[PDB]
Design an enzyme around this catalytic site. Structure first.
Site, PDB file in Angstrom:
ATOM      1  N   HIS A  63     -17.333  -4.307  -4.356  1.00 14.35           N
ATOM      2  CA  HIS A  63     -17.575  -3.007  -4.974  1.00 14.35           C
ATOM      3  C   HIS A  63     -16.463  -2.637  -5.942  1.00 14.35           C
ATOM      4  O   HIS A  63     -15.346  -3.131  -5.827  1.00 14.35           O
ATOM      5  CB  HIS A  63     -17.688  -1.940  -3.895  1.00 14.35           C
ATOM      6  CG  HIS A  63     -16.573  -1.994  -2.901  1.00 14.35           C
ATOM      7  ND1 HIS A  63     -16.655  -2.722  -1.734  1.00 14.35           N
ATOM      8  CD2 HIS A  63     -15.334  -1.445  -2.917  1.00 14.35           C
ATOM      9  CE1 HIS A  63     -15.523  -2.594  -1.060  1.00 14.35           C
ATOM     10  NE2 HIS A  63     -14.705  -1.829  -1.760  1.00 14.35           N
ATOM     11  N   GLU A 118     -11.696 -11.144   5.309  1.00 11.96           N
ATOM     12  CA  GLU A 118     -11.721  -9.897   6.059  1.00 11.96           C
ATOM     13  C   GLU A 118     -13.137  -9.654   6.581  1.00 11.96           C
ATOM     14  O   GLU A 118     -13.951  -9.005   5.912  1.00 11.96           O
ATOM     15  CB  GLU A 118     -11.266  -8.698   5.219  1.00 11.96           C
ATOM     16  CG  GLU A 118     -11.009  -7.455   6.082  1.00 11.96           C
ATOM     17  CD  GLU A 118     -11.756  -6.204   5.619  1.00 11.96           C
ATOM     18  OE1 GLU A 118     -12.368  -6.221   4.529  1.00 11.96           O
ATOM     19  OE2 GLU A 118     -11.718  -5.190   6.355  1.00 11.96           O
ATOM     20  N   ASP A 166      -5.819  -0.447   8.513  1.00 14.40           N
ATOM     21  CA  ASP A 166      -7.057   0.138   9.007  1.00 14.40           C
ATOM     22  C   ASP A 166      -6.978   0.560  10.463  1.00 14.40           C
ATOM     23  O   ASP A 166      -6.098   0.133  11.214  1.00 14.40           O
ATOM     24  CB  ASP A 166      -8.219  -0.844   8.856  1.00 14.40           C
ATOM     25  CG  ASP A 166      -8.853  -0.802   7.471  1.00 14.40           C
ATOM     26  OD1 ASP A 166      -8.703   0.219   6.767  1.00 14.40           O
ATOM     27  OD2 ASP A 166      -9.517  -1.793   7.094  1.00 14.40           O
ATOM     28  N   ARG A 224      -7.011   7.248   9.020  1.00 13.04           N
ATOM     29  CA  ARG A 224      -6.280   6.001   8.813  1.00 13.04           C
ATOM     30  C   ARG A 224      -4.910   6.271   8.188  1.00 13.04           C
ATOM     31  O   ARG A 224      -3.961   5.507   8.390  1.00 13.04           O
ATOM     32  CB  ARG A 224      -7.084   5.049   7.941  1.00 13.04           C
ATOM     33  CG  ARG A 224      -8.263   4.445   8.667  1.00 13.04           C
ATOM     34  CD  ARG A 224      -9.042   3.529   7.747  1.00 13.04           C
ATOM     35  NE  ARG A 224      -9.664   4.273   6.658  1.00 13.04           N
ATOM     36  CZ  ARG A 224     -10.272   3.705   5.620  1.00 13.04           C
ATOM     37  NH1 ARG A 224     -10.340   2.380   5.535  1.00 13.04           N
ATOM     38  NH2 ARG A 224     -10.820   4.459   4.675  1.00 13.04           N
ATOM     39  N   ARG A 232      -7.099 -11.960  -0.382  1.00 16.24           N
ATOM     40  CA  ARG A 232      -7.772 -11.316   0.736  1.00 16.24           C
ATOM     41  C   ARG A 232      -9.181 -10.948   0.276  1.00 16.24           C
ATOM     42  O   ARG A 232      -9.367 -10.088  -0.613  1.00 16.24           O
ATOM     43  CB  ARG A 232      -6.994 -10.088   1.205  1.00 16.24           C
ATOM     44  CG  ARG A 232      -7.592  -9.364   2.411  1.00 16.24           C
ATOM     45  CD  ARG A 232      -6.748  -8.138   2.746  1.00 16.24           C
ATOM     46  NE  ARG A 232      -7.331  -7.291   3.788  1.00 16.24           N
ATOM     47  CZ  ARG A 232      -8.328  -6.428   3.592  1.00 16.24           C
ATOM     48  NH1 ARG A 232      -8.889  -6.299   2.391  1.00 16.24           N
ATOM     49  NH2 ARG A 232      -8.778  -5.701   4.603  1.00 16.24           N
ATOM     50  N   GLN A 274     -17.335   4.353  -4.250  1.00 14.93           N
ATOM     51  CA  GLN A 274     -17.252   2.889  -4.208  1.00 14.93           C
ATOM     52  C   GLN A 274     -18.664   2.307  -4.295  1.00 14.93           C
ATOM     53  O   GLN A 274     -19.437   2.413  -3.352  1.00 14.93           O
ATOM     54  CB  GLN A 274     -16.548   2.409  -2.925  1.00 14.93           C
ATOM     55  CG  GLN A 274     -15.014   2.522  -2.956  1.00 14.93           C
ATOM     56  CD  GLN A 274     -14.385   2.550  -1.565  1.00 14.93           C
ATOM     57  OE1 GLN A 274     -14.825   3.295  -0.692  1.00 14.93           O
ATOM     58  NE2 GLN A 274     -13.354   1.727  -1.354  1.00 14.93           N
ATOM     59  N   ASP A 306     -11.907  -9.036   0.577  1.00 16.64           N
ATOM     60  CA  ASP A 306     -12.229  -7.725   1.111  1.00 16.64           C
ATOM     61  C   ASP A 306     -13.736  -7.554   1.346  1.00 16.64           C
ATOM     62  O   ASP A 306     -14.552  -7.912   0.489  1.00 16.64           O
ATOM     63  CB  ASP A 306     -11.702  -6.658   0.140  1.00 16.64           C
ATOM     64  CG  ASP A 306     -11.977  -5.252   0.610  1.00 16.64           C
ATOM     65  OD1 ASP A 306     -11.258  -4.801   1.523  1.00 16.64           O
ATOM     66  OD2 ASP A 306     -12.903  -4.600   0.074  1.00 16.64           O
TER      67      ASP A 306
END
Ligand SMILES: OC[C@H]1O[C@H](O[C@H]2[C@H](O)[C@@H](O)[C@@H](O[C@H]3[C@H](O)[C@@H](O)[C@@H](O)O[C@@H]3CO)O[C@@H]2CO)[C@H](O)[C@@H](O)[C@@H]1O
Ligand SMILES: OC[C@H]1O[C@@](CO)(O[C@H]2O[C@H](CO)[C@@H](O)[C@H](O)[C@H]2O)[C@@H](O)[C@@H]1O
Ligand SMILES: OC[C@H]1O[C@@](CO)(O[C@H]2O[C@H](CO)[C@@H](O)[C@H](O)[C@H]2O)[C@@H](O)[C@@H]1O
Ligand SMILES: OC[C@H]1O[C@@](CO)(O[C@H]2O[C@H](CO)[C@@H](O)[C@H](O)[C@H]2O)[C@@H](O)[C@@H]1O
Length: 628
Positions: free
Chosen positions: A187, A328, A393, A509, A284, A254, A286
């Protein structure tokens, strides 16, 4: 379908006959040409499995591979050396030498120049691996902590410039540290140029997202979608100002990129090549599980998602062999592991181990953790877990219901308990966490809070420091690449301002995203403080891990301790690890220890331990016994 040779001869058509001869003789072209021959068939097969007879497939592929050549041609010599080294050492990820850290550049060091100044500290700690949280331009105010990207090329000006980042990465490499950054490829932000142009009806950006005229398809999709941020919006869709609806798995700002459009693959592959040539060692990946959608399904973990990532992998084998992938995937354990593979993601987060570490602190019973280390730890050749204790997270309780049921545990009821325990709503809890994303459709919730907050350090529980040590000991020694959430190594507590900050107040978070605590880091060499005790404990475990070959590789065999409070496992048939998860002394009996040598050196405490008699562990004690 085309072939490697055909594509290469067309790539070379951009040159004059004279230049072309210089190119084909060149070392860069020779390397590219053989990697093309070796790896293009995988690329073609993966893309064919997703896009099939799509008219745009061949033109996209030719455009992409022309860009891949230009990228590799431009790639600097030092990175090309790393390409060769990792090309002939697939298992570099599995070495006990590797220890990782992650931090926000702004929170930990102010900006990129400041981060560069902290590199001597990373060397002091012993890091070989540093993940920097999202660096690039994003919306002001709310950007999901930078995960709503508004430009993949422009650094967030608060952090510095793209030149600053290139310098940081060079400096990390000089210090013997791999650079790890996010590939945010599921995204973009709604303020990203692609998003604006697509919604405005620019033909060039047609079908770059999933946009619908009304709620007809969104409603049908939402029948089976599981909400990620239930506080933010229902289902997986948000409404535009003009009345249309767009797929937004995460926040409304997003927007999910549309990988059913091959030009989207090319766009993000292009971005991948850009980050590669910055010298990024590990991307990473995502939100990997969301990159393919299908009506009637939960639109996660779908076969095309895996094929797309394997397509990305082949692009790196061709044009940046050094660049590895970290998956992830926070989902069911059966699905988490499917992303990990030499030809897919070579490493991946290990949320099962992470979540069960915290579970075991709560229950004092190692049953689920033992089960997991026994049946779900060992991985295919040339891959590894990333083992962690905390991250940026929340903690999700993603153990398998089926696994728990085999132990007579109800997953639903157990999570109800864990979610009350870790937010201090259970008699006696040492935990001081904060809820995240309570969900009224499932009864689900997650937990926010720093490692120190969750073990009792905020109220200076006398067991807190030892709990931190125990948790990190297991991530450091089970096998895989351990990842420290920077700040944990001095006992950093929850942020004190997040709840009343209007940009943050709806996202707990932020509780476990504090700034660099000057006071704590200044205490790190004083063993009379919690900060110094934690730091020296962790630093010691890091030093032992990195120096002692018994920790090498990713494989383990569990050891039945016959004590429900003590976890046991053996690395390389030479290192016996015990962890007492009880706040009381616990004993492994002489009978259980019969096969072990009479005496063994404990790497943790330094003493010689007798194993021909009962072994009694003090509260939360960890032992690393050299048994060969
Ligand atoms: O450390 C405190 C306490 O934690 C552990 O007990 C908890 C269970 O692990 C947990 O699953 C939950 O038990 C409930 C069941 O899930 C549910 O199916 C039903 O049977 O009721 C149970 C109680 O509500 O909660 C308990 C704690 O209440 C650990 O096993 C204990 O020994 C320990 O004292
Ligand atoms: O040199 C290969 C061969 O390719 C032919 C075209 O069939 O020309 C192509 O390659 C040239 C050199 O790279 C390019 O200048 C030209 O644009 C391209 O069509 C022949 O001209 C050439 O002999
Ligand atoms: O301290 C609670 C604080 O957390 C925020 C958002 O993260 O909400 C979280 O906690 C609520 C329970 O207190 C949950 O209902 C919610 O789903 C969860 O995200 C704030 O809403 C709240 O003030
Ligand atoms: O080994 C002798 C004796 O130990 C018991 C305890 O249950 O088993 C233990 O010994 C093995 C030594 O490696 C371990 O593999 C096992 O996990 C451990 O529990 C009995 O199996 C056995 O009679």
């Amino acid at each position: 379908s085309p072939n490697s040779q055909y594509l290469k001869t067309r790539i070379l058509d951009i040159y004059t006959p004279e230049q072309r001869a210089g190119i084909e003789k060149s070392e860069d072209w020779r390397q590219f040409s053989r990697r093309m021959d070796t790896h293009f068939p995988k690329l073609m097969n993966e893309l064919d499995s997703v896009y099939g007879n799509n008219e745009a497939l061949l033109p996209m592929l030719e455009m992409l591979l022309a860009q891949a050549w230009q990228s590799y041609s431009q790639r600097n010599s030092s990175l090309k050396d790393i390409d060769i080294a990792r090309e002939n050492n697939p298992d570099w990820i599995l070495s006990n030498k590797q220890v990782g850290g992650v931090c926000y550049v702004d929170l930990f060091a102010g900006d990129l120049k400041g981060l560069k100044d902290k590199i001597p500290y990373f060397q002091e700690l012993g890091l070989t691996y540093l993940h920097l949280m999202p660096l690039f331009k994003c919306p002001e105010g709310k950007s999901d902590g930078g995960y709503a990207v508004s430009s993949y090329r422009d650094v967030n000006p608060a952090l510095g410039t793209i030149g600053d980042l290139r310098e940081v990465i060079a400096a990390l490499h000089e210090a013997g540290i791999s650079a790890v950054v996010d590939f945010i490829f599921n995204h973009t932000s709604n303020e990203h140029e692609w998003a604006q142009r697509c919604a405005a009806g620019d033909p060039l950006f047609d079908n770059f997202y999933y946009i619908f005229p009304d709620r007809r398809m969104p409603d049908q999709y939402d029948r089976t979608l599981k909400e990620v941020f239930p506080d933010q919006h229902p289902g997986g869709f948000s409404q535009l100002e003009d009345g249309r609806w767009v797929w937004t798995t995460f926040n409304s700002f997003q927007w999910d990129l549309n990988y059913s459009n091959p030009w989207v693959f090319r766009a993000m592959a292009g971005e991948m090549l850009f980050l590669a040539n910055l010298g990024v060692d590990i991307l990473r990946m995502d939100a990997v599980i969301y990159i393919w959608k299908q009506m009637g399904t939960s639109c996660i973990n779908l076969p095309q998602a895996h094929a797309l990532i394997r397509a990305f992998n082949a692009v790196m084998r061709i044009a940046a062999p050094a660049v590895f992938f970290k998956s992830e995937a926070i989902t069911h354990p059966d699905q988490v592991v499917q992303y990990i593979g030499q030809d897919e993601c070579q490493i991946g987060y290990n949320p099962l181990q992470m979540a069960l570490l915290w579970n075991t602190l709560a229950t004092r019973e190692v049953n689920l953790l033992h089960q997991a280390l026994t049946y779900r730890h060992n991985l295919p050749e040339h891959t590894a877990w990333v083992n962690y204790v905390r991250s940026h997270d929340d903690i999700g309780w993603t153990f398998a219901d089926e696994d728990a049921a085999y132990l007579g545990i109800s997953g639903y009821d157990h999570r109800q308990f864990l979610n009350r325990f870790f937010v201090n709503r259970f008699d006696g809890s040492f935990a001081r966490g904060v809820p995240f994303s309570y969900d009224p459709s499932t009864g689900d919730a997650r937990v926010s809070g720093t490692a120190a907050a969750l073990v009792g350090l905020a109220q200076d529980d006398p067991h807190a420091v030892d709990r931190i040590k125990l948790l990190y000991s297991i991530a450091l020694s089970t096998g895989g690449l351990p990842l420290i959430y920077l700040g944990d190594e001095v006992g950093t507590l929850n942020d004190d301002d997040w709840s009343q900050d209007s940009n943050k107040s709806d996202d707990s978070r932020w509780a476990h995203r504090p700034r660099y605590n000057e006071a704590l880091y200044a205490q790190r060499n004083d063993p009379s403080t919690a900060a110094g005790q934690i730091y020296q404990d962790l630093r010691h475990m890091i030093a032992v891990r990195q120096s002692n070959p018994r920790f090498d590789g990713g494989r383990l065999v569990t050891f039945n301790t016959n004590n429900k409070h003590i976890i046991g496992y053996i690395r390389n048939n030479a290192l016996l690890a015990f962890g007492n998860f009880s706040e009381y002394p616990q004993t492994v009996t002489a009978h259980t220890l019969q096969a072990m040598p009479f005496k063994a050196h404990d790497l943790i405490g330094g003493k010689t331990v007798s194993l021909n008699q009962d072994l009694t562990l003090q509260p939360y004690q960890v032992m690393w016994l050299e048994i060969a």
